[PDB]
Amino acid sequence: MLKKKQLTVLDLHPGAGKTRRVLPEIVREAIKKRLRTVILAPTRVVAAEMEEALRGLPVRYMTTAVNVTHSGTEIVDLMCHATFTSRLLQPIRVPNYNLNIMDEAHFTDPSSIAARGYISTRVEMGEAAAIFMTATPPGTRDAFPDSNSPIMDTEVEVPERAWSSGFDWVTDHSGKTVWFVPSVRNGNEIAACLTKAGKRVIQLSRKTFETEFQKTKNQEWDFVITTDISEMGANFKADRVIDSRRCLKPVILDGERVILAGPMPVTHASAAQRRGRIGRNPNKPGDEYMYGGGCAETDEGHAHWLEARMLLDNIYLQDGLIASLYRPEADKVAAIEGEFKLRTEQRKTFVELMKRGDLPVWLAYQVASAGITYTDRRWCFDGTTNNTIMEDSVPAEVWTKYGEKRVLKPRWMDARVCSDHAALKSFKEFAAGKR
């Protein structure tokens, strides 16, 4: 496993003990063999759970989610998938790790796909070893894998809007339910319907994840309404999962705009991870999984794989060489390796637009490749009339850094900057030059 030139996929079923049992054994062996090691966590929540499982082992936590005093003698580093990809992109020196361990290696965010591509390329070159830990590796076709205890699987119509009748089974339940919705806006509507019926609801999404997840431990709740982010190792002490089996898919149209297509079916990997939140306790057989549609390979042509190539084309590997995507997920995009490689100054703009600007990868690339500098926000206002961003069915307006009231009409339209109130508020602040 730990020998150079080897990539191992640790594919034990969900709840089999990959993080709490297998991971500390691997880390202990890596420290014994003097292997400079990196452990990659999908989120800050998982990074905190990993510290608990690794307590007593000398690990340098490169995240503010863990409060530890490092001795300076650790040869194992732990950081989030995004942090690893970010440090590779920035001028900062990243050690050439002998062993690369990725937990929740099924994560399909652009920085996670790019991290897999880089690490797998290093292993292919015979320079390093890697271990990818996931119950659902890329290409998996089984939405119903093994579990610690039997699960009641039921195909049923699941609401995606508020309802007045026809779904008594949803509210008649007396336990705790984790409900996967296709979007933040869809979750808001269902959460309001359940709150009106007397239920205590917590909502989770990528932007509110660390703060709102704490509420699942600190208070009594009846429902957790979440997007696909809870597929990445978040654990709940729940009795039931309700799964719409739907997700939004960012799609690049004619290479000039990004729309959020769907809702459409999730992959089998996503369905298995959603179901995998329950059936984890061998002492409580009969947790329920209610599912509202079929699976499909909706990752083919998904913007995230093209965005992963934009990231990889701008990471130094060796001379003019470029890291390829991890082989089982390479056909998800039709791209030319190196097509997105930027010159030094435009690359710095690209990185700053993502890191400080908080823009999606595709949108950051359009701005940087056009030769626009980070602080120049004229492009947020000079697009075509069809790129007008709407807020409450009326064009969104902002006061520019010059003091002029203008309609938000970006030269490149990426639907992710206005998919919910929180995203549109952050994009308005960016267009106004507030960051």
Ligand SMILES: [N]C1=N([C]C(=O)[N]C2=[C][C]=C(F)[C]=[C]2)[C]=[C]S1
């Ligand atoms: N899962 C769930 N539930 C059911 C149960 O647990 N059951 C049992 C136990 C034990 C035994 F021995 C037998 C059975 C409820 C709620 S959640």
